[PDB]
Amino acid sequence: WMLVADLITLTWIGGQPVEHPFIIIGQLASILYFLIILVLMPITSIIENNLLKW
Amino acid sequence: ATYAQALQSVPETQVSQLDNGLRVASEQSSQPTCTVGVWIDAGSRYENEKNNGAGYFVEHLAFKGTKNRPGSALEKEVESMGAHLNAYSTREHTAYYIKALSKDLPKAVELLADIVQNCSLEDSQIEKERDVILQELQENDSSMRDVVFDYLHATAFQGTPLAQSVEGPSENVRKLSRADLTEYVSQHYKAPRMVLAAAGGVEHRQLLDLAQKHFSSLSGTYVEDAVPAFTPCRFTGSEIRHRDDALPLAHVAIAVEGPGWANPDNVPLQVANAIIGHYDSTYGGGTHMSSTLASVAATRKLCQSFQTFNICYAETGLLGAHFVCDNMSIDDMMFFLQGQWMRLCTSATESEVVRGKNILRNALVSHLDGTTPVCEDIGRSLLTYGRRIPLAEWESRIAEVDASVVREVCSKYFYDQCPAVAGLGPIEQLPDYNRIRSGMFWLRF
Amino acid sequence: PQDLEFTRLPNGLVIASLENYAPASRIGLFIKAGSRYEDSNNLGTSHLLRLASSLTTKGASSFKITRGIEAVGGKLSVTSTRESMAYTVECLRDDIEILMEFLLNVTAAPEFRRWEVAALQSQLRIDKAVAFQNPQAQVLENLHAAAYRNALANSLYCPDYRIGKVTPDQLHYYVQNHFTSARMALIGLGVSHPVLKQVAERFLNMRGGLGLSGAKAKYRGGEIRDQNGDSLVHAALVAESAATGSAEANAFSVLQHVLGAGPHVKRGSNATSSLYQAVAKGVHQPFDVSAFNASYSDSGLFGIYTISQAASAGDVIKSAYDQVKAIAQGNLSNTDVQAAKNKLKAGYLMSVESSEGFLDEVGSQALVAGSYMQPSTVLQQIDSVADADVINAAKKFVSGRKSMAASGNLGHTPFVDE
Amino acid sequence: MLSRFLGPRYRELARNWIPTASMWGAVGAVGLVWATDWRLILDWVPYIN
Amino acid sequence: AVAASSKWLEGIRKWYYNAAGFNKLGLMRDDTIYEDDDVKEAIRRLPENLYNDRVFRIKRALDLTMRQQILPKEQWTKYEEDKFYLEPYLKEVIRERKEREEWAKK
Amino acid sequence: MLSVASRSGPFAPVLSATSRGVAGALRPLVQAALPATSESPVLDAKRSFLCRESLSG
Amino acid sequence: TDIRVPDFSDYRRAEVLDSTKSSKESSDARKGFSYLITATTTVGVAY
């Protein structure tokens, strides 16, 4: 649900003009879309594997 | 104490020769029994279409009485000392041999010389050996493996003497006279074409003087003595299909043309066939076996058995495989077998070649166990190589085979070549010859 | 040279080794087990045990046993009689130490896992149907059931109702009670005697003595007839004779070769076989006839075996039985006795030529008698058999109670009381 | 954990297959310019102009 | 493998067992595993009484999810009563796969 | 003293790991084969009888 | 054994009618001929 809220942010930013608050927000949200799928999701499944004693 | 040191302490073979050209060979091994016999260059490839059942007819009359010991008197003498008589006939060789006690050696050599020189082909034993041979032919038709290898020779060597069968057709058996058998012995049972071999508790000096006492009256050179002409035989890619749906299983044999006896390519081609292997449904190994075709057929229950062969003649041969399966499995067995031939022409690894070399070393020493297989190896190596190749020489040829040698020799004999196919039984799912011929080359390499 | 080195261990194990200088080696373990030691509740356990030598053990998995033996080109085989089982390993001289380790895991620490034993039950049906394509095999299993009430009447193959129901607990119980060190012998053929001994001190932690006494076999004079659709009639007719390792057993071995025990010449007419000549006087059709001899540790069987056509089967059995009656009333020449001693002497020396026959011969002597005897001693015991003892062994057959088994079209085959 | 490439026997994986491919990384510089209507290798030789 | 956090890290394990909710459907931990090829070989090797227990527990949980309901709280699977019935059979299947893979490269 | 194969007639089965199953010693005893028409039938679970056990190498 | 292949001489190529050899040799010739007759077709359908 953090990934769904990240795609709502990019839909709002993409209809805004290219100004001061909508460049630092629109480029950090572009980073977090790739950080969740590639890095954060495989590490969190391994942490949940250790907590269930397998 | 070492396998290398044990190959040095094997006793050697001593060869001699008489004035007529007869060779005499022995191996002494310090045991109270022995095996002595006579090996002849004769067979069905020396017969034409008029006398194709001549050499197999003569092997039947060989123990039925000679001039000195008529009728059953030969059989009473062999049995009363506890000895055994045996014989066989292939397409190129003929043998008679005796297993006896090593102190009965002078009597054993005397009986063998009377069998091959003075055998009576009496006209009442003929016309009663015809019906025995005619009934034996009907018994051979129930053996599916013997029928399908006769089909493979008849289609690979179509218009040559090498396509004939050993037994000969049934119309020849009905008409072979006494005159045709006496011409067969005079033309073929000749002393430079014969070998007297012995293994066991034998001294070579004793066998040589027994050979001079009983065999010296053999004709050395002949009347007009023309050189025995050797017509070679060519290979033809072809197929023969015998469809019979009432039989429960199907037999299929396929081969390409292989090398002759004295070709040095024979040793790495036997390392290669030992990687494919053999399988049978009574094996305990099953799905864990090293051979890929054996492990697949055990997991999916594809066949009853398969085997690979290496048949050699003087100038040519057959190199292939034979399998038995049900009517729904022929297309899958042919697909996996042809994929293993192409995977040795390319891609053959060093770890497969180490296993295949260990199999061939074990099969060579396991054959030479007992006086009868040692004596047969002496008698047919002198007709084939002109000498006995010792076990230390076989090991140095095996040790120089590696993975790149196997890839070169398999590509030479298998890759993009026309095979010969034979099939018998419920064979509607045996693939078309165009689809079989396309299986001998790849898309990539 | 170096004839044999024979040794008893303090736990009862027999070790024998002969040092060849042959490139191959052979190791065999011989056990007093087999079908005579099972009872009516576990029939067929020793047939499944014979088929289970590749399964997972405690020291090696089933993958490593198949791959590890095939990597050096070796073999592993099991052979069984009613009284013994034998585990054999062969390879080249430099590979023998790692195949000796596989042989000790199979026989001294097996696991019988549930899913592996359950997958092997269908192999019992394949193995029995292959063996029963020979008509001799089922006739000889019916003959032991007709002759005994117990303990030699059990078949070498599993009964049909029992296929699918041999359990892992039965296999564990059979090995625990019958694979013990005082019932075992270890025979080597290309290995030195110190190497086999420290091999042997790696299976003595369990299996310390004798496990279970078997029941003594009791003779039954029965008869089993099996009508089917075969083209020829197979029949056998026996009586009780003598146990192995006695002076009367040697007289029955000579009597077998007087009568006829197989052919010597290829496609010969069997001129010295007195059984074959007496049948062929009145019968002018295809047949075969032989003398049968089976010797065990506490009993034995001796008789005749005929193969004939259906309409001629009564004539073949009656003329074969009449020839044995002539020997029992004194008609016996010393020329025929001396010719029979030559076939028995030469056949024993020829059966010990190969490595396979020599290793089996040392293994049977170690379990039955617990010693080794040179073949010069065996050849003098055959020489001491007199003409009066051959006539007296044919009188024990003629006056003894008979057993019979037949198969084929039995419309002209006589009953055992007729 | 794709260590099936890392083995001491299948190093000859790539030694029986690359002698096929001695030109096969440059067949686009031999074969595609047959249809591109460019001059990639058309200056290399006086074969073609 | 820390002795100072022996009880603290067992508190996070017991918390995660209740936050996950297969125990509310009456399931054990080995009921919820994803069935790849090694898991499907371990199910085939189970004894007949443990196989039949697993099949009924899964069917009862699929029927509860169809109705969007859970079990009464006295019928939930306890944390220190969950039996890892599949774990000895699965460790042996994987060890056999890794043995056939070292052999294929050596 | 001796084996059951020396005093020939009682039979024995074998199982191998890489070879075929064999039954008995004197069960195919011969000169029933020189008398005419002894046919070994076609089988449904058929086996190889020479079974590599006498191969030349 | 009464079964033999019927004669194929009025279908054979010229190099394999001698019936004595040309088993292994003159085999690269007769299939290298019938591979050229198809290899022109692919460059004939390339263009």
B382, containing H or E segment:
helix B371-384
Q: Which residue(s) pair with B280 in the sheet? A: B305
Phi, psi of B50 (to 5 degrees): -85, -25
Q: Which residue(s) pair with C187 in the sheet? A: C16, C28
- d(CA B179, CA C11) in angstroms, rounded, equals 74
Residue B184 CB burial class (10 angstroms; 0-12, 13-18, ≥19): buried
F12 Cβ contact list (under 8 Å, min separation 6): C79, C80, C81, C156, F4, F5, F23, F24, F25
Beta carbons of F8 and C293 less than 8 angstroms apart: yes
- d(CA B270, CA B266) in angstroms, rounded, equals 6
How far away is chain B from the Cα of D49, in angstroms, using its nearest Cα? 34
Show the tokens assigned to B255.
């081969």
B48 Cβ contact list (under 8 Å, min separation 6): B161
Question: Which residues in chain F have Cβ-Cβ distances shorter than 8 Å to C360?
Answer: 3, 5
Answer whether A20 touches E (CB < 8 Å).
no
Residue B432 carries which DSSP code?
Answer: P
Q: What is the dihedral of CA C366, C370, C374, C378, to 10 degrees?
A: -100
- d(CA B399, CA B416) in angstroms, rounded, equals 29
Angle between helices C96-108 and C62-70 (to 10 degrees): 150
- d(CA B113, CA B37) in angstroms, rounded, equals 10
Q: What is the resolution of this structure in A?
A: 2.4
Show the tokens assigned to G11.
């279908």
Residue of C61, C64, C167, C169 to mutate, testing the E interface (most E Cβ within 10 Å of its Cβ): C61
Sign of CA dihedral B246, B250, B251, B256: positive
Residue C213 CB burial class (10 angstroms; 0-12, 13-18, ≥19): exposed
DSSP secondary structure letters along C97-149: HHHHHHHHHHHHSB---HHHHHHTHHHHHHHHHHHTTSHHHHHHHHHHHHHBS
Answer whether B288 touches F (CB < 8 Å).
no
Residue B25 CB burial class (10 angstroms; 0-12, 13-18, ≥19): buried
Closest by Cβ to B445, choosing from D9, D12, D20: D20
Beta carbons of C105 and C59 less than 8 angstroms apart: yes
Show the tokens assigned to B419.
């095979």
Question: Which residues in chain F have Cβ-Cβ distances shorter than 8 Å to C137?
Answer: 11, 23-24, 27
Helix (H, G, I), strand (E, B) or coil at B380: helix
- d(CA B399, CA B283) in angstroms, rounded, equals 30
Neighbours of G8 (CB within 10 A): 13
Q: Which residue bears the tokens 């192409």?
A: B342
F54 Cβ contact list (under 8 Å, min separation 6): B367, B373
Active site residues per annotation of B: 59
Angle between helices B403-413 and B350-367 (to 10 degrees): 80
Q: Which residue(s) pair with B424 in the sheet? A: B242, B251
Beta carbons of B237 and B244 less than 8 angstroms apart: no
In chain A, the N- to C-terminal Cα span, in Å, equals 26
Beta carbons of C328 and C398 less than 8 angstroms apart: yes
- d(CA B155, CA B157) in angstroms, rounded, equals 6
Phi, psi of E44 (to 5 degrees): -65, -20
Question: Which residues in chain B have Cβ-Cβ distances shorter than 8 Å to G22?
Answer: 234
Helix (H, G, I), strand (E, B) or coil at B280: strand
Residue closest to E30 by CA, chosen among E104, E82, E100? E82
Residue closest to C81 by CA, chosen among C32, C48, C117, C24? C32
| Strand order across the B194-200 sheet | B14-17, B23-28, B194-200, B33-40, B94-101, B84-89
Alpha carbon separation from B50 to B47, B58, B61, B151, F27 (Å, rounded): 8, 15, 20, 21, 40
How far away is chain G from the Cα of B206, in angstroms, using its nearest Cα? 45
- d(CA C148, CA C165) in angstroms, rounded, equals 26
Residue of A44, A45, A51 to mutate, testing the E interface (most E Cβ within 10 Å of its Cβ): A51
- d(CA B166, CA G20) in angstroms, rounded, equals 20
Neighbours of B319 (CB within 10 A): 25
- SS3 assignment for E63-97: HHHHCCCCCCHHHCCCHHHCCCCCHHHHHHHHHHH
Residue closest to F25 by CA, chosen among F15, F17, F14, F36? F14
Residue closest to C25 by CA, chosen among C69, C74, C63? C74
Show the tokens assigned to C162.
């029992």
How far away is chain B from the Cα of C273, in angstroms, using its nearest Cα? 10
- d(CA F23, CA C157) in angstroms, rounded, equals 11
Show the tokens assigned to C98.
């790692």
Beta carbons of C348 and C378 less than 8 angstroms apart: yes
Alpha carbon separation from B104 to B202, C175, C250 (Å, rounded): 11, 49, 25
Alpha carbon separation from C379 to B103, C1, C250, C341, C384 (Å, rounded): 15, 20, 11, 9, 9
Beta carbons of B440 and B419 less than 8 angstroms apart: yes
Count how many Cα atoms sit within 13 Å of the Cα of residue F10 in the half-sphere of its side chain: 25
Contact yes or no for B132 and F34 at CB 8 A = yes
The amino acid sitting at A38 is L
- d(CA E89, CA E39) in angstroms, rounded, equals 9
Residue closest to C402 by CA, chosen among C303, C307, C292? C303
Neighbours of C210 (CB within 10 A): 13
Residue closest to F28 by CA, chosen among F16, F19, F40, F36? F40
Interface of B with G in 159-198 (CB under 8 A): 159-160, 163, 165, 167-171
- d(CA B172, CA B49) in angstroms, rounded, equals 9
Long-range contact pairs involving B143-148 (C-beta distance under 8 Å, separation at least 24): B143/F40, B144/B247, B144/B249, B144/B251, B144/B324, B144/B424, B144/B425, B144/F42, B145/B251, B145/B322, B147/B251, B147/B424, B148/B251, B148/B252, B148/B253, B148/B322, B148/B422, B148/B423, B148/B424
Interface of C with E in 94-133 (CB under 8 A): 114-115
Contact yes or no for C61 and E100 at CB 8 A = no
Q: Which residue(s) pair with C236 in the sheet? A: C305, C405
Count how many Cα atoms sit within 13 Å of the Cα of residue C11 in the half-sphere of its side chain: 19
How far away is chain C from the Cα of E86, in angstroms, using its nearest Cα? 15
In chain E, the N- to C-terminal Cα span, in Å, equals 35
Q: Which residue bears the tokens 């194969």?
A: F5
Show the tokens assigned to C188.
């080597």
Contact yes or no for D8 and E106 at CB 8 A = yes
DSSP secondary structure letters along B207-267: HHHHHHHHSTTS-SS-SS-------------EEEEEE-TTSSSEEEEEEEE---SS-TTHH
- d(CA B38, CA C21) in angstroms, rounded, equals 30
Beta carbons of D42 and D48 less than 8 angstroms apart: yes
- d(CA C279, CA C320) in angstroms, rounded, equals 6
| Strand order across the C75-80 sheet | C5-8, C14-17, C184-188, C24-31, C85-92, C75-80, F14-16
Residue C185 carries which DSSP code?
Answer: E
Q: Are strands C403-408 and C288-295 parallel, antiparallel or unpaired?
A: unpaired
- d(CA B377, CA B198) in angstroms, rounded, equals 10
Q: Which residue(s) pair with B308 in the sheet? A: B321
Closest by Cβ to C63, choosing from E44, E47, E100: E100
Residue of F22, F31, F34, F48 to mutate, testing the B interface (most B Cβ within 10 Å of its Cβ): F48
Closest by Cβ to B365, choosing from C23, C94, C268: C23
The amino acid sitting at E88 is P
- d(CA C287, CA B36) in angstroms, rounded, equals 32
DSSP secondary structure letters along B349-376: -HHHHHHHHHHHHHHHHHHS-SHHHHHH
Considering only alpha carbons, which residue of chain D is nearest residue E102? D7
Neighbours of B205 (CB within 10 A): 11
Show the tokens assigned to C137.
């095999």
- d(CA B193, CA B191) in angstroms, rounded, equals 5
Residue closest to B40 by CA, chosen among B257, B237, B189? B189
C242 Cβ contact list (under 8 Å, min separation 6): C248, C249, C252, C295, C300
Beta carbons of C130 and F44 less than 8 angstroms apart: no
Interface of C with F in 248-277 (CB under 8 A): 249, 252-253, 256, 261-263, 267-268, 270
C336 Cβ contact list (under 8 Å, min separation 6): C258, C274
The amino acid sitting at C36 is R
Strands (E), B326-443: 420-425
Considering only alpha carbons, which residue of chain C is nearest residue B10? C22
| Strand order across the C300-308 sheet | C223-227, C403-408, C233-240, C300-308, C288-295
The amino acid sitting at C211 is G
Considering only alpha carbons, which residue of chain D is nearest residue E103? D9
Q: Which residue bears the tokens 């198809």?
A: G38
Residue C333 carries which DSSP code?
Answer: -
- SS3 assignment for C215-243: CCCCECCCEEEEECCCCCEEEEEEEECCC
Residue B198 carries which DSSP code?
Answer: E
Residue of B80, B349, B350, B364 to mutate, testing the C interface (most C Cβ within 10 Å of its Cβ): B80
Residue closest to B420 by CA, chosen among B272, B260, B266, B253? B253
- d(CA C372, CA F6) in angstroms, rounded, equals 16
Residue closest to G46 by CA, chosen among D31, C328, B390? D31
Beta carbons of C275 and C304 less than 8 angstroms apart: yes
Beta carbons of A26 and A10 less than 8 angstroms apart: yes
Beta carbons of B43 and B95 less than 8 angstroms apart: no
Show the tokens assigned to A52.
């269930």
- d(CA F7, CA C344) in angstroms, rounded, equals 9
Show the tokens assigned to B135.
């009934």
Closest by Cβ to B234, choosing from G1, G7, G23: G23
- d(CA G28, CA B236) in angstroms, rounded, equals 14
Q: Which residue(s) pair with C98 in the sheet? A: none
Answer whether D16 touches B (CB < 8 Å).
yes
What was the elucidation method?
cryo-EM
- d(CA B333, CA B297) in angstroms, rounded, equals 8
User: Phi/psi zone of residue C353: left (φ > 0), alpha (ψ -120 to 50 degrees), beta?
Assistant: alpha
Contact yes or no for B324 and F39 at CB 8 A = no
Buried b vs exposed e over B393-426: b needs ≥16 C-beta within 10 Å? Answer: ebbeebeebebebbbebbeebbbebbbbbbbbbb
In chain B, the N- to C-terminal Cα span, in Å, equals 47
